[PDB]
């Protein structure tokens, strides 16, 4: 059915899957350059956008 997806309900690098897709990573903020997400993302692995980690 589904795939490993960010809990916000969207493929993101923070959820590796057999397809490893994360969507177009908007390089417009301090994210892993693999976080395409935007909308309602309570995933801790995506909130992380502070300090070099
Ligand atoms: Zn996938
Ligand atoms: Zn994300
Ligand atoms: Zn997300
Ligand atoms: Zn996430």
Number of strands: 0
Helix content estimate = under 10%
Annotation field: number of helices: 1
The best one-word shape is globular
Query: Which ligands appear in the coordinates?
Result: zinc ion
Domains (count): 1
User: What kind of sheet is the major sheet?
Assistant: none
- Round the Cα radius of gyration to an integer and report it: 11 Å
Strand content: under 5%
Indicate the structural class: little secondary structure
H/E series, N to C? H
Terminal CA distance: 33 Å
The oligomeric state is monomer
Report what the structure shows.
The chain is largely without helices or strands. It has one domain (1-53). The protein has 1 helix and no strands. The site of one zinc ion has 7 residues, from loops.
Question: What's the topology here?
Answer:
Blueprint: H1 44-47
The structure holds zinc ion (4 copies).
PDB class: metal binding protein
Keywords: solution structure, wheat Ec-1, Metal-thiolate cluster, Zinc, metal binding protein
Assembly: monomeric
Core attributes:
monomer, 53 residues, little secondary structure, binds zinc ion, metal binding protein, solution structure, Zn binding, Metal-thiolate cluster, monomeric
Short description:
The chain is mostly loops and 53 residues long. The chain has one helix at 44-47.
